[PDB]
Amino acid sequence: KFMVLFIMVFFAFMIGMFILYSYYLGAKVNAAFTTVEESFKTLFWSIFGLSEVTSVVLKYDHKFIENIGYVLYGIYNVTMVVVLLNMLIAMINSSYQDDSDVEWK
Amino acid sequence: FLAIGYWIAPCSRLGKILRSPFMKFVAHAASFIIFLGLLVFNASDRFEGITTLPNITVTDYPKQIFRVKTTQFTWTEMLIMVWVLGMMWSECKELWLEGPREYILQLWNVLDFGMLSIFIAAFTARFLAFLQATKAQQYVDSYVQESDLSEVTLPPEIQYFTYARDKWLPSDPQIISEGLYAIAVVLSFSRIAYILPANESFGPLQISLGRTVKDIFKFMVLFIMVFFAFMIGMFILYSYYLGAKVNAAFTTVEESFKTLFWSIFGLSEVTSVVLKYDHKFIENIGYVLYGIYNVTMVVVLLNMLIAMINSSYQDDSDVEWK
Numbered sequence: 138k139f140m141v142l143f144i145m146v147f148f149a150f151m152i153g154m155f156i157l158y159s160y161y162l163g164a165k166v167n168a169a170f171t172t173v174e175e176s177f178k179t180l181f182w183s184i185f186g187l188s189e190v191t192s193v194v195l196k197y198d199h200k201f202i203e204n205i206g207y208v209l210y211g212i213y214n215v216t217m218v219v220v221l222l223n224m225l226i227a228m229i230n231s232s233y234q235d236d237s238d239v240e241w242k
Numbered sequence: 243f244l245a246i247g248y249w250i251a252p253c254s255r256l257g258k259i260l261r262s263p264f265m266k267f268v269a270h271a272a273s274f275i276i277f278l279g280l281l282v283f284n285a286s287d288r289f290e291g292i293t294t295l296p297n298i299t300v301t302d303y304p305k306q307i308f309r310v311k312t313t314q315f316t317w318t319e320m321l322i323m324v325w326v327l328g329m330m331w332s333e334c335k336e337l338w339l340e341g342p343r344e345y346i347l348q349l350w351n352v353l354d355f356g357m358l359s360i361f362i363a364a365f366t367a368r369f370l371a372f373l374q375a376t377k378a379q380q381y382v383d384s385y386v387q388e389s390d391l392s393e394v395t396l397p398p399e400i401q402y403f404t405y406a407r408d409k410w411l412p413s414d415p416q417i418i419s420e421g422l423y424a425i426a427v428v429l430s431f432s433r434i435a436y437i438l439p440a441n442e443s444f445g446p447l448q449i450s451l452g453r454t455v456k457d458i459f460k461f462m463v464l465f466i467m468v469f470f471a472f473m474i475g476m477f478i479l480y481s482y483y484l485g486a487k488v489n490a491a492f493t494t495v496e497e498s499f500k501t502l503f504w505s506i507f508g509l510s511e512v513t514s515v516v517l518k519y520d521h522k523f524i525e526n527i528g529y530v531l532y533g534i535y536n537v538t539m540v541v542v543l544l545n546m547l548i549a550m551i552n553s554s555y556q557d558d559s560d561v562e563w564k
């Protein structure tokens with residue numbers, strides 16, 4: 138049930154960052170957000186810290202678009218932690234309320 | 243078609259069912275799903291990527307100014323602009339009816355006004371770019387007949403609009419438009435949480451999510467003071483070693499901010515503190531300051547995690563959701 142909340146957050150930045158970087162296909166350090174699939178790949182592996190910060194860096198001097206990508210990618214990481222932190226706390230409280238023995242037997 | 247039926251037959255079988263509060267929530271949710279569909283479908287030609295490199299210009303007809311083709315509004319674009327005008331009008335009426343004070347005193351009203359204003363700014367910026375392109379286009383059709391802009395040397399003011407994306411000015415309206423449009427699209431999908439309270443399964447989850455965000459807000463203030471302590475301290479240490487470092491980690495206040503922010507997620511490498519020169523005293527201080535920052539940041543995060551766990555330890559989520 139918590140994934141559904143994070144899918145909405147994930148899809149918000151997948152479309153938003155892909156739209157931002159779709160026109161800079163050959164003008165980026167890598168292929169991070171140039172396509173919807175690459176936008177999915179980058180944001181999924183950012184959950185485990187496996188996506189580098191150069192994902193948002195541009196070869197061109199369009200610092201406005203590059204700095205927006207920094208903030209959107211920075212907000213995504215902060216938002217993802219908050220969603221994970223909320224899931225961790227909520228599931229801890231759910232367990233706080235000899236029942237595991239009954240369910241196993 | 244349902245909207246048309248309401249106008250022609252306001253008082254009918256269709257009128258009563260459409261006036262039901264559940265059907266007016268569904269209709270508002272349905273319209274916003276269409277709006278998100280228009281946002282996604284607008285960029286549907288780039289799902290697999292752009293065939294043309296940002297270095298090469300493609301024009302539909304030989305005499306066209308390139309910036310005309312890249313700034314012209316399509317039929318999907320017009321629908322998005324109208325949907326925004328419709329959404330903004332509803333927010334303006336709520337601002338006028340409820341009041342300029344109570345309106346603000348709601349998380350959704352400020353967020354909805356924020357994302358609609360960014361949409362308007364994004365479209366205003368693109369409109370300004372479109373006007374400039376038309377002015378360049380007007381010059382070509384009324385003064386140029388030089389076989390597809392091959393040998394003719396246009397004035398520099400007008401020649402700029404035949405350039406590819408790489409030659410665009412860093413602050414031209416087209417770049418500002420798509421930069422703001424991306425922010426609005428991300429903010430748009432945040433409104434999906436506006437319809438989540440109605441569901442009995444995902445409604446309580448969003449209530450608890452908002453409670454944690456409010457809890458984290460007060461803890462950030464503590465971490466901002468820690469973050470700003472090392473941002474200034476490490477920038478001061480490394481500011482003089484601009485060309486004498488492995489990278490540009492702490493050479494400027496912005497680079498000092500970038501490095502320390504991504505260190506939260508482990509995305510800043512240890513070579514951020516390494517110097518090219520033999521000044522090991524400054525390099526080892528940077529190691530300790532960067533090491534202390536990571537340890538301090540964990541302690542602040544650990545304190546926030548524990549405090550928020552105890553805050554929840556004291557059937558109340560059901561009451562808050564209902």
Ligand SMILES: [Ca+2]
Pocket residue numbers: 336350351354
């Ligand atoms: Ca509202």
